[PDB]
UniProtKB/Swiss-Prot annotation:
Disulfide bonds join 6-127, 30-115, 64-80, 76-94. Lysozymes have primarily a bacteriolytic function; those in tissues and body fluids are associated with the monocyte-macrophage system and enhance the activity of immunoagents. Has bacteriolytic activity against M.luteus. Substrate binds at residue 101. GO terms for molecular function: beta-N-acetylglucosaminidase activity; identical protein binding; lysozyme activity. This is Lysozyme C. It comes from Gallus gallus. The active site is at 35, 52.
């Protein structure tokens, strides 16, 4: 599924991400824009053989099981395929564990490089939330 901007903001609020760990909804929408372009089915292979999955590009090195990332963990206790669903529940639940892990949203390098410090409220501007 490819979300629209306000459609995703709404879905993220419905699943409890707005102001989770103090990160406003525009932070989460901005991270999703630059990680996946709002596409739930996005996959990207990393140099090290891990893969990033879904709207928030969650990495198989730590968070999900894809059966092909040697020496990796599955701390969200989910198959990485669950992170590709039209329903963002699995991605949100897992993202809550990642953002609680100690470095906040810096875990998302695209959020650090493209969203952190910017006017992230623009991402929810005009949305009926
Ligand atoms: Cl957009
Ligand atoms: Cl915001
Ligand atoms: Cl594996
Ligand atoms: Cl594990
Ligand atoms: Cl699995
Ligand atoms: Cl959803
Ligand atoms: Cl923080
Ligand atoms: Na893994």
């Amino acid at each position: 599924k490819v979300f629209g901007r306000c459609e995703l903001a709404a879905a993220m609020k419905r699943h409890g991400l707005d102001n989770y760990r103090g990160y406003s909804l525009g932070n989460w929408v901005c991270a999703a824009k630059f990680e996946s372009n709002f596409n739930t089915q996005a996959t990207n292979r990393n140099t090290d053989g891990s893969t990033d999955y879904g709207i928030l590009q969650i990495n198989s090195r730590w968070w999900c099981n894809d059966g092909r990332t040697p020496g990796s963990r599955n701390l969200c206790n989910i198959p990485c395929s669950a992170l590709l669903s039209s329903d963002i529940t699995a991605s949100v639940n897992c993202a809550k564990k990642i953002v609680s892990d100690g470095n906040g949203m810096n875990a998302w390098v695209a959020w650090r490089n493209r969203c952190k410090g910017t006017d992230v409220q623009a991402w929810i501007r005009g949305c009926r939330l």
